[PDB]
Write a protein that binds this ligand. Structure first.
Ligand SMILES: O=CCCCC[C@@H]1SC[C@@H]2NC(=O)N[C@@H]21
Ligand SMILES: O=CCCCC[C@@H]1SC[C@@H]2NC(=O)N[C@@H]21
Lengths: 131, 489, 244
């Protein structure tokens, strides 16, 4: 299953819609991983239309961190020669109303390594992003 | 400390200094002049002097490259110009003429300052002359953040590109009060000169943005494309994308039926680098696309027809749009890449009553006068004078290519069959139109004459374009000596 | 960090100071090569480096003769400016002048010819120029020492500067012919307060900005880096006709 989970996310499809979200949500459901299912499983678990399951706090935090890293990496490309920055303090907030402003730092110690933290003078984790 | 700007933000609007701070780098703005007064002494203006005098001019720095800018201030006197306001702008433009640096201005003026008399006209004239002289020397970009009325509208017009903000901006020559006075019609300011009107109807505005923040964010991206001056070379940026990336999806873009339509962006996007298109005038004359893009890390100019809208037929508005884009691109040594799909010109009385002859000649003049490297690709068809206009090989074109299902003919098969057989026996349609289209509506004849270099598979377009654009990097061509041309206005 | 420049200028207008205390912090360490050190000591000329590039230095000195322009100083500065411009070398000047040296010997020796040489050299030059007014600039001396109107690139002043037509006494005398006696006390002070300050010259637009003395190195490096590629040309001539 884990393999499928991972393999679903690496399938790049552009130009038309698909049902990969439904497959992902069905596989990730703890009912499906319980061990047994039924033939009325789908409509039993999807009474009104279809609604994809949401994200937990840590997943949304990780998405924020990766977004900040990507922003910094693409920003450094446009600068000329060595006149480029290496650290910022960003304020990420999804939604049109800025729901949950989360301050973020970034350091870009190498080509594919950062020092993400809460802000300046905050403990750093040194994750990795390759894009 | 957030003093004196609470009144501004309460109206859901930003300040000039905040806009300047958002545009440039975090700490690289050096305000030039800050303690200047109007010295008017008329109509009870001897009092209420202001330190900044309603203008903010500085130098700044974007992406490590220098810039010059100025911003109007709406709080102070409504942003009106004077004998003294225009002096700062003139000094900035003169300095940016000595050094090869561009100029960007954020217009917010409410009109002229009446209390100065004709001195406002003097300042306007000086700014107009500087814009006229320095156009083609340094790129000029203008953004309109608020009201812009009176005769001040003309200086943004001479500038290369004008952008507009959606909710709280407008521009026109004469106010609606005079329109009501003379004609008797009641029209609001937005109905007269709103951003939508200039985006779709008049064709003056080159774009529209939803917010000031987005305006700055994308203005930086636009600035990343431009060359610094007239004599400086085209910028080249590092990029991980490579010319060996596979593009085989182009083999299927063109439908096998001649009456079905397709989107030209499906051809434009694969050739250029990923996520590197900046469309210019997206909502005006949609049958033609113009903008900037990068090919192997160097900025180029894109001009292509679109059979999605009106069968990709040339027109007045499309001609003006393409002509302006080509002229600007050539003025600053930027390569041009074109994609051709045209059945001809739009037929109609309104067209001749509006002067198609003048307007359609502008694109041809711009294409013929240009001396930058050109690359042309004929995908499906090219008929009549439209084939000549859209950068044909005879107009000193560098390299021309065609796709295996193209067609290059004098006109459609029906008209040729009609003219070639006056009173030939009836039913001549079936056994003559098919034969003529088979024999002469194909790139074989044009290739025999030598009008296309080679017939290529659609999968090799990126390879060919990168090769040619790399080889043509150092072309030196010059026109005969002239004081200047005489373009059909 | 150069914060020692905040204290170089004394708070009294009649006390003297050494201009080298202003010259040395701005340029790089141990990089001054004085030219003609023992002749016309009221003016200093030489070569120096700013951020690794050679520049030309021309500054007055209130230590010697109150920093007053003269014949010999004019010749020295004119020759230095002409040589520096001939070979595309940036020029940086520091201004502190009360005027020209008064005396019969001066007119009997041709001050009119010699003082025009420095003005000609400053006006003819096309290299980037930077000017800093520390304390004062009066009369034609302000015009001569690379004023903004002579196609100067950037001009700066310090917060206690003074730019006026002449001293307060002469202006008060000419502005009130036979005004009631004791006019000295309540007129000279007022005129010096109102017009012997950089506010009026800044209002007219003759100085770009009024800066803290601690930012001089930053401003000079920024301007000299930006001005690296200026291209200016004079009208066509076989050659000039300088006042010999
Ligand atoms: O066959 C009759 C109408 C054909 C029009 C073909 C297109 S419409 C605009 C343009 N002008 C032409 O003469 N041909 C094209
Ligand atoms: O007040 C009387 C004498 C003031 C002289 C002030 C200095 S001396 C040389 C120069 N020439 C002037 O007119 N003023 C300055």
């Amino acid at each position: 299953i884990g393999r499928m989970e991972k393999a679903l996310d690496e399938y790049v499809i552009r130009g038309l819609r698909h049902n990969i979200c439904l497959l992902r949500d069905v596989v990730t459901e703890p009912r499906y991983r319980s061990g047994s299912i039924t033939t009325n499983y789908l409509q039993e678990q999807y009474p009104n239309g279809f609604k994809k399951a949401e994200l937990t706090a840590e997943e949304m935090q990780l998405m924020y961190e990766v977004a900040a890293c990507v922003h910094l990496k693409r920003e450094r490309l446009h600068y000329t020669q060595g006149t480029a920055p290496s650290e910022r303090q960003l304020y990420l907030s999804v939604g049109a109303g800025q729901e949950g402003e989360t301050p973020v730092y970034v350091r870009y110690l190498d080509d594919s390594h950062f020092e993400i933290g809460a802000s300046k003078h905050g403990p750093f984790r040194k994750m990795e992003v390759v894009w | 400390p957030t003093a004196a700007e609470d009144l501004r933000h309460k109206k859901k609007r930003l300040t000039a200094m905040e806009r300047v701070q958002l545009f440039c780098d975090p700490g690289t703005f050096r305000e030039r002049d800050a303690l200047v007064e109007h010295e008017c002494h008329n109509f009870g203006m001897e009092k209420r002097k202001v330190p900044g005098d309603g203008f903010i001019t500085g130098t700044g720095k974007v992406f490590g490259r220098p810039v010059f800018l100025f911003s109007h201030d709406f709080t102070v006197f409504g942003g009106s110009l004077s004998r003294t306001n225009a002096a700062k702008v003139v000094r900035i433009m003169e300095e940016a003429a000595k050094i090869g640096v561009p100029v960007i201005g954020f217009n917010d003026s409410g009109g002229a300052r009446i209390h100065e008399g004709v001195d406002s006209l003097a300042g306007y004239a000086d700014i107009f002359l500087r814009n006229t002289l320095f156009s083609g020397v340094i790129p000029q970009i203008s953004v309109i953040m608020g009201p812009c009325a009176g005769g001040a509208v003309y200086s943004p017009a001479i500038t290369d590109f004008t952008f507009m903000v959606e909710t709280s901006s407008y521009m026109f020559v004469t106010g609606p009060e005079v329109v009501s006075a003379v004609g008797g019609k009641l029209v609001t300011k937005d109905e007269l000169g709103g951003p939508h009107v200039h985006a779709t109807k008049s064709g003056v505005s080159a774009g529209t943005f939803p917010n000031d923040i987005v305006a700055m964010a994308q203005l930086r991206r636009l600035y990343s494309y431009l060359p610094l001056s007239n004599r400086d070379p085209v910028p080249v940026l590092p990029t991980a994308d490579e010319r060996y990336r596979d593009v085989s999806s182009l083999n299927t873009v063109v439908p096998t039926e001649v009456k079905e339509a397709y989107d030209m962006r499906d051809v434009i996007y694969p050739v250029i680098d990923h996520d590197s298109f900046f469309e210019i005038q997206p909502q005006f004359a949609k049958n033609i696309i113009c903008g900037f893009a990068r090919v192997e890390g160097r900025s180029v100019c894109i001009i292509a027809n679109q059979p999605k809208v009106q069968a990709g037929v040339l027109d007045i508005d499309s001609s003006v749009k393409g002509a302006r884009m080509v002229r600007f691109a050539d003025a600053f040594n930027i390569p041009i890449i074109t994609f051709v799909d045209v059945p001809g010109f739009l037929p109609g009385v309104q067209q001749e009553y509006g002067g198609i002859i003048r307007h359609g000649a502008k694109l041809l003049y711009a294409y013929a006068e240009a001396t930058v490297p050109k690359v042309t690709i004929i995908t499906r068809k090219a008929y009549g004078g439209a084939y000549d206009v859209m950068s044909s090989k005879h107009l000193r074109g560098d390299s021309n290519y065609a796709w295996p299902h193209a067609e290059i003919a004098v006109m459609g098969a029906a008209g040729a069959c009609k003219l070639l057989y006056s009173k030939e026996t009836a039913e001549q349609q079936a056994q003559r139109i098919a034969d003529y289209e088979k024999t002469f509506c194909t790139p074989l004849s044009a290739a025999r004459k030598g009008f296309v270099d080679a017939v290529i598979d659609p999968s090799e377009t990126r390879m060919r374009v990168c090769e040619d654009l790399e080889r043509l990097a150092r072309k030196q061509l010059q026109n005969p000596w002239k004081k200047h041309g005489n373009i059909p206005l």
